[PDB]
Design a protein around this nucleic acid. Structure first.
Ligand SMILES: [Mg+2]
Ligand SMILES: [Mg+2]
Ligand SMILES: [Mg+2]
Ligand SMILES: [Mg+2]
Ligand SMILES: [Mg+2]
Ligand SMILES: [Mg+2]
Ligand SMILES: [Mg+2]
Ligand SMILES: [Mg+2]
Ligand SMILES: [Mg+2]
Ligand SMILES: [Mg+2]
Ligand SMILES: [Mg+2]
Ligand SMILES: [Mg+2]
Ligand SMILES: [Mg+2]
Ligand SMILES: [Mg+2]
Ligand SMILES: [Mg+2]
Ligand SMILES: [Mg+2]
Ligand SMILES: [Mg+2]
Ligand SMILES: [Mg+2]
Ligand SMILES: [Mg+2]
Ligand SMILES: [Mg+2]
Ligand SMILES: [Mg+2]
Ligand SMILES: [Mg+2]
Ligand SMILES: [Mg+2]
Ligand SMILES: [Mg+2]
Ligand SMILES: [Mg+2]
Length: 206
RNA sequence: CGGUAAUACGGAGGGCGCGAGCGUUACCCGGAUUCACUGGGCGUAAAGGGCGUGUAGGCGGCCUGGGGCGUCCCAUGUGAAAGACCACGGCUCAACCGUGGGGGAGCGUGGGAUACGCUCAGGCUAGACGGUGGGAGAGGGUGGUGGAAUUCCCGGAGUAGCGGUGAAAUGCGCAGAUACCGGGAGGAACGCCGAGGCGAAGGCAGCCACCUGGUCCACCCGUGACGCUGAGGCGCGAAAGCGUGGGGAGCAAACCGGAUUAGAUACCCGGGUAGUCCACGCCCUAAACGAUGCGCGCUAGGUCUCUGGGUCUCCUGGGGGCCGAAGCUAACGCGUUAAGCGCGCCGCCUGGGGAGUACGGCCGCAAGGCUGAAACUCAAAGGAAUUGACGGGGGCCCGCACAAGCGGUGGAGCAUGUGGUUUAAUUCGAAGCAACGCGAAGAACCUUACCAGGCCUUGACAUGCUAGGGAACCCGGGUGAAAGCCUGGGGUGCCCCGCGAGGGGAGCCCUAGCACAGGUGCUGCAUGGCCGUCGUCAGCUCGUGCCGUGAGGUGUUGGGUUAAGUCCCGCAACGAGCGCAACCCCCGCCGUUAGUUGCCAGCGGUUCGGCCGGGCACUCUAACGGGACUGCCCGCGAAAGCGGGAGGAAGGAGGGGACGACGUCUGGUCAGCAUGGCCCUUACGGCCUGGGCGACACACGUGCUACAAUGCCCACUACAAAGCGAUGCCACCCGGCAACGGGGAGCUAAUCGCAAAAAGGUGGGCCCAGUUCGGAUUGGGGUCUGCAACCCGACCCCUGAAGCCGGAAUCGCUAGUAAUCGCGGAUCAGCCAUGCCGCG
RNA sequence: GCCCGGAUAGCUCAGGGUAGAGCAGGGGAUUGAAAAUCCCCGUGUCCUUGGUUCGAUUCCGAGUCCGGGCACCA
RNA sequence: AUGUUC
C-alpha cells in the first residue's frame, strides 16, 4: 500500500485535469454525474478506437467533449455515420446538446493509457506476458520517451499464485514533480480473472 | 504427480515409437573412472596405522666384464571341428548352410640379440655406516637438595569477626578464629629466566651429581651400496582406570551441606572420598592432530628465529615460524618443513544410518580393548565456499528507544469500540506492534447485510424475443401493520389510409410464455484495485570492465563528513538507475500588480464605531515575484565539512506539509468497487410492518468528566483563526426561568448570519468540608426533529452516586512541541460526537 | 497441686490503637504466544472469663485445653 | 549470577 497516483500527484503542476468546468455546491453534483455517464458510455463504445482521454469542458451550460483517440477512423465511420449516432447517443443520455470532437493522439506509443491497453489486450489473448511487457517498453523508448515502466499484476499465464511482472527502461522519477509521467491503467479480464496493467511513460522535465 | 483451470490419476480425441508383435517381471554386462591394469583416491568429503623397532616380502647408485633366467627377434610344432572375421558360392532373398582364406594369445623345440631387469665376478664413492674434533638441548633413568606458597600442629601477640556471592547462606570463630610473628611437620609443583628447545610418538621445565639415548656441524680420515620400506612379531604409548603396597599438603569425580530454579539430581558457595603423588605390575585408549605414513631426488625467493661452521658488511649446514614463484586444490588453502613434480614400500577408503553394535575369536583381574559383519532402513549423508537471516557475538552509528523532564493511562463515574456471555436476532468484517472512538465522515423506521411474522414472483433493476388485451398518464373503493391482493373510474397527444367510415402506428404501461435478471451466499492462499506495515529507515539495483570453475564479488569493504549510498578522500573500477535531495503547497521578511464587500494615516464633515466625503497609504485579501547560497569573516581540516562571528525577517535542511525505493508480511479488504471459481432460483432473490445490531455476571482498548483553592460559582469586561450557510445561516422584537415558539429584516454572502471564543482581566461569593469540589443516578414537568423517540434521540427546567490523585504495570511529547483553553467542519431530519479532520 | 510456655483465617504461621504474609481459587499485569515472574480481591468470637483503659488479640488477674519440668493422688 | 518453549 503505497505510491500515489502519478496524475493525482501532479494536477496543478506538470499535468492537467481531464474535466475543467466550474460549478457551485448546488450544481457540481449533477454535472459530475453527467461527466461520468458520459465517460462511461464513450469508454466502452470507443474501445476499438483506443481512447486515451475524454476531456470535458463546459461553458454556457453546454458541453464539449474531446475524445483523444488513436483511431479516429473508427469513431468517425465512412463519411461519419458512426460519430453521428455517437453524438445522438450522448444527447439521448444527457438531456442536452453535446459537442463530440475527435483528436488524434499523435504518438500512441507515448500514451500510457494506450500502451497499457495494448498490453492488456495482448494478455487477454493469451500472449506471453514477460515478452509483451518488455516489447511495450521497447516501443515506448523507440518513440523517444526519456523512460518507461510497465507492470502486469498477477495470475500471469493463468497461475494459482498471483504475481507481478514489472520491466522498465530509462528514468521514471516518480518523486520528481516537474517530471510529466503519463500513467495508464487497463484491465485484462480473463478466464482466470483479472490482471491489471500499469504503464508509466516519462516524457521530459519542466 | 494428485488440495477444483492436473500436458504426471481415469477416459476421449490427437500424437510418438515399434509392429505379428508390443509391454512387464527376473537375471547378466553396460552406463559405473562406483574396486580405477587400462583408469580413482585418504588435511577438512570415506580413507595415514598412536609412535618406534624390525621378520618375510617388495623395491635397489656409478663403471667394466662373464652368463643369457626375465625380455625382444626369427624359424618351427601346437593352438581340432563348429563359432567369430574376410571372400566367393547354395537355398528366389535373408536367416540357415557350403567351400576357401586370414588371423589368435598361450605353451614346446631350434636358432639369434644383450639395451633394460636378474645373476656371478671385479671396480668406484655421490647413498648408507664409521673415526677424530667440537656443539645445543625440559630427551631418558637413579640418587640427592633449594626456596616461594598452601595446609596442619605447638607457641606468641592481639580481638570480633573471618570466609564467601550476582546477592546470600552453609562453614569457621570468645574452647579466641581472620590478619601478624616465631617454631615445626608434611606433600605436591617448580615463579622470574620463558619465546624458544629435546624426543619416533606419547611427552619432557628448580638446582646438583652419576648413569644414558637421539641429534647437528667440521676435517674429508676409514668401510665400500652395507640401502629404502616393512604384512606379521617385539617394545613405547597422555589422562582416566585396575591390582598390591606406600604416601596424602593442595586439588577434587562420587557424596554431604548452602544457594539458584518451575524443578536444579547442574552451573555459583562451604566441605568431601576415591583419585591426582611414589614403587612395582596391569590397562593400550584419545580431537594419540599437522585430523597430512616413511625414505630419496627435483622445482623462485623474501623475512623472523634456534643451533653448528666459516679470509665473517655476507656465505654455508641442521632445525622452527610467517609470506609467497611455478604448480596443485572442490574450495579453504598447500607451496624447498608441499597438499607441487616424480620413484619405492607400507597402511587405509568405496553412500548414510544400523555400528565400532551383534556373533565368533584373541587379549585383559576388571573396566574394557582389538578383530568386525548382516537384516532392515533412508535418497541422501557429506566437504568447501556464496547470499542472507539470526545471536543472551564485536565495532561504529541512529530514532521520544532509554535517560532528563512535563503531563497522562491502569483506580472512580460515564462515553465508546472489543472479548465474552446472552438472545429469536443480538448481521458482517478488523486480532500484537500494524484489530479494539477501526470499515461506520451520523443504526429509532431508512440505513440493514440479522430475527420474527405478513407478502412478491420475469421479479426492485438490465438486454431482447412471442402474443389476445392494454397500449403514456392520473384518480379514488375495499381488505390489511404495511407491503400486497382485489377494485372502479377519469381517458389516447402520436406516425398515419383521410375531407371521413374506419384503419395502419411508434413510444409507453399492465397479463401470460420465453430467454434472463437478483444474491452484503463462499473463497482476500484463485484475483485486480486500493490500503496497512517494516520505514521517510538509507537503502535496492543496473550497464560495461575487472576477480572467481561457480553461486557470487567489486562498484556499494576503508578514512572522514551528513538528516541521507549527502558530500569528500581513497580504491579495479568508470558510469547509471529506483530511492535521498531538489522541482510542488503552507508558515515566516519584503517588493510589484489590484482598492470592494476589506483597511482608515493625514483631511472635511458626523445621528461615534469608517457613518459620508475623500484616499489605498498602512492592515488585509491574492496573484506574480524577490530573498539564504556556509555567499561573506575568523578558526580547525588534505577535502567534504565543522566551531564561531557578522550582516539579515529568516540560516547552516528557517518551521510545517505533500511525497514512501527493490521488496517484506501467503498482512488487510470478494461487505465500497471490480473480478476467476464455487454455490442459491415460489428463494440464499424481492417488498413490508415490528424487533435487533443499543442485550449485561463479567474482562480489555481508546476517550471524556473529575477528586478541587494555581480551584469552584456569579456578574461584568476583552483579544482569535479556520470553516459553514438562500427550503439554509438567521440579525432584531416579543412570550416564555428556559429549551424553544410566535413575528421578522439581512445574506446568491471579504456585504448578512451562525458568533458567545474560551482560558484571560476586573468585581464579588465559597473558606478546606465529600464541600458552592464532582455531576453519576433517579423522579417529575417542558421543548425540538420526525409518519413515529416503548425498546432507543437530543435539549431545557426543579435528586446529588463514586471519586481525597489511583497496584503490578503502562502511554504521549524535544518548542510554539507538551500541557491547557475554547472555535469550525464533514456525515447529518434529529443524534447518542466525550469520536474524527481542522482552526486558532 | 507448683513453675514455665502455647491457643490468631481452611491449614501453617507472623505480630495498647491497626489484624496480617504464605499456601489454594479468581481477576489483572509481562510475552507475538505459553510457562516462569509481578500485582489486587474475599477469609477471623485473635481460647474463655472478669479487670485496667477513652480504646485490649496486645497490659493485669483468674479459668479451660494443650506442651515442658518437678511434686502426688486419699 | 540464573531464566524454558513454539
Ligand atoms: Mg567397471
Ligand atoms: Mg573417488
Ligand atoms: Mg566430520
Ligand atoms: Mg575424514
Ligand atoms: Mg600419524
Ligand atoms: Mg630385506
Ligand atoms: Mg659389487
Ligand atoms: Mg675418503
Ligand atoms: Mg598408559
Ligand atoms: Mg595415571
Ligand atoms: Mg592405585
Ligand atoms: Mg572402581
Ligand atoms: Mg565445591
Ligand atoms: Mg585416525
Ligand atoms: Mg604459504
Ligand atoms: Mg564378544
Ligand atoms: Mg523517561
Ligand atoms: Mg478508568
Ligand atoms: Mg465475509
Ligand atoms: Mg492478501
Ligand atoms: Mg480475514
Ligand atoms: Mg491470509
Ligand atoms: Mg454497533
Ligand atoms: Mg466515598
Ligand atoms: Mg478535599
Amino acid at each position: 500500500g503505497n505510491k500515489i497516483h502519478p496524475i493525482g500527484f501532479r494536477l496543478g503542476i506538470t499535468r492537467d485535469w481531464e474535466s475543467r468546468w466550474y460549478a457551485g455546491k448546488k450544481q457540481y453534483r449533477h454535472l459530475l454525474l453527467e461527466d461520468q455517464r458520459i465517460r462511461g458510455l464513450l469508454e466502452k463504445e470507443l474501445y476499438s478506437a483506443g481512447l486515451a482521454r475524454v476531456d470535458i469542458e463546459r461553458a454556457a451550460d453546454n458541453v464539449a467533449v474531446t475524445v483523444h483517440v488513436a483511431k479516429p477512423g473508427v469513431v468517425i465511420g465512412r463519411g461519419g455515420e458512426r460519430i453521428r449516432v455517437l453524438r445522438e447517443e450522448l444527447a439521448k443520455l444527457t438531456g442536452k446538446n453535446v459537442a463530440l470532437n475527435v483528436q488524434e493522439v499523435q504518438n500512441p506509443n507515448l500514451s500510457a493509457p494506450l500502451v497499457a491497453q495494448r498490453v492488456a489486450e495482448q494478455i487477454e489473448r493469451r500472449f506471453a506476458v514477460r515478452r509483451a511487457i518488455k516489447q511495450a517498453v521497447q516501443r515506448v523508448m523507440e518513440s523517444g520517451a526519456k523512460g518507461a515502466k510497465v507492470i502486469v499484476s498477477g495470475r500471469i499465464g493463468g497461475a494459482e499464485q498471483a504475481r507481478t511482472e514489472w520491466a522498465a527502461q530509462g528514468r521514471v522519477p516518480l518523486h520528481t514533480l516537474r517530471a510529466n509521467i503519463d500513467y495508464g491503467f487497463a484491465l485484462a479480464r480473463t478466464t482466470y480473472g483479472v490482471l491489471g496493467v500499469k504503464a508509466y511513460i516519462f516524457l521530459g522535465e519542466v
